[PDB]
Design a protein around this ligand. Sequence first.
Ligand SMILES: [Ca+2]
Ligand SMILES: [Ca+2]
Lengths: 273, 122, 123
Amino acid sequence: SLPACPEESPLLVGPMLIEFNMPVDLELVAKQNPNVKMGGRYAPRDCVSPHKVAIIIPFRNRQEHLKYWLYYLHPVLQRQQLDYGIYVINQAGDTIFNRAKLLNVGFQEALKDYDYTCFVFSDVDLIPMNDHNAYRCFSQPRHISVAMDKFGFSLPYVQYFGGVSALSKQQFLTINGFPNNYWGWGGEDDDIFNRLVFRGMSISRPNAVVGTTRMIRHSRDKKNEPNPQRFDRIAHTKETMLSDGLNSLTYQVLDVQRYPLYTQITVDIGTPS
Amino acid sequence: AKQFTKCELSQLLKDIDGYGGIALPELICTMFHTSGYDTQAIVENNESTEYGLFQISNKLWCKSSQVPQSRNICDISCDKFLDDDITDDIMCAKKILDIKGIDYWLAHKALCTEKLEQWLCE
Amino acid sequence: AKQFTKCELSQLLKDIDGYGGIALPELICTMFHTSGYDTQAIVENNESTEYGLFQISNKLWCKSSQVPQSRNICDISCDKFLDDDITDDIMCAKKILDIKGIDYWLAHKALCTEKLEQWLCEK
Ligand SMILES: [Ca+2]
Ligand SMILES: [Ca+2]
C-alpha cells in the first residue's frame, strides 16, 4: 500500500540560517506546513517511517521561544520523514521548575495518543543548524545537541547529556525513566547520563558539524534557580534510580490543548519534599 | 540590512585566501556559525558586546560607551560593524587574524578544520 | 570582567596543583561545573550567597552585608571574589581545602573523579 521510507531522506538540505530577529506568526507557520495535522502530528504520505517519534518539550511561560521552535523544527522534521508528534508539557503553578519530571509526563502522556517507539527530549530554546542531525533514536541513547553555540560549539564535557536527546522506548524503560526529585536548574541531565551508563548503555552522537545548535538568548529565571542539592544527588544515582523514576511518578493533568502546531498538556507535578 | 550568502561572501574575502595559513573555506565555515553571514548580528553581554558579521568584541578591538578603556585596536567605533558595508569589518577582522589568529573565533577549531567541501565556492 | 578557559585556568592554578592531593585537572573539572570558569558567577540562596570562580560561600568564609555575623575564615570581603584576579580566591580555596577538603565542592565527587583526561590543556 505504501513503501518503506529510505534510511536517508532525499529532502535534506544541510546547513540552515537560524534567525531570532524577526516576528513569527503561528497562524502562518500552520499554513506554511499544511501537512501537519491538529495536535502537531505529521506522517509522510509518501512512505512508512520506522521512526515513531514523540517530541517532548518541558515548558513554562516561554511562548515566544515556542514560536521559533515550531517555526524551524516542523519543516526540518517533515524533511526528515518522521512519523512524529509535538508535546509541550506545561507546568502549572509558580513553584520551582522540574525539567526531568515534565519529561516523564510527556513520555507517559504521548503513549496515550499513539504507539511511539522513539522519544526526543528537547528544550524549547534549542534549534538545530543542520537537518542531517537526526531527531530520532538509535541502538544507543542519542545526544542531539552536541555542539552548542553557548559552549563555543564544543561539548562542554564528554559525559554531558543536556539540551536535546533521543531515547528509544526500551532505553527509557531500562533506566526507570527520568528522576522526579531534581527541583530547580541543573543535574537532571547528569543523573540521566548516570542511569544509562549504569545499565550498560553508552552515548551516541552525530559529529560536531552536524549537531550544531543555536540557543535563544534569555535572562535566567527565578522559578528555576540553580539546584543546590544536585551535585550531591548526581553522586548517588545508582542507588536512587530504582526508587525515583517512572515507577514513582505522580501528577495531576489539569488541561489538554490540541493546537494546530502542538499538543499542550498542562500538568500539576507537585512541589519539592 | 544586509545578509550575505556563502558564495557571495566568499568572493569578498578572496584576498584572505592564503592569508597566514588560512583557507577561505575554513573561514566561511567560521562566520556561518559565528554570525550566519548577518551584517547586523549582535551578541550583548553584561560587560561586553560582539558586533556584526565577524562578531568583533568591544573589549579591545573597537570602541563603545560600554567599554571606554578599550584599546580600540581597529581604531573605530563598534557600531560601524553594523552598516551594510563590511569593507571596514574586513579591515578589522584582518587585524584580528594578524594578531590573535583565526582561533579568536571559537567555531574554527571546533567545526571548521574538516568537512570543508560544503563551504567551498569554486 | 573575566571568564577563563580550560587552558588559561591551567596556568593560574599551578601553585595549587597537588595541594591537598588534588591534581590540576580535578580543579578545572570541579570549577567548571561549579561556576563555568566565570569570576563573576553569583548564586544567592535563601540565607547565603556563593561567590566567584570557586563559589565561596558568605555563610562562613567571607565578609558580606547579607551575612554580617559570618566567621569570615578567609579574612576578606566577599566581593573580592568577583574581580578578574583569582590570586586571593585561590588563597581562600587553599584554606577551604585545609578545613573542609575537596568535598566543599560536591561537583568533584559527582563529575570530576573519572575521565580527567579532557581537562588538560592541549598546547
Ligand atoms: Ca560595517
Ligand atoms: Ca579575587
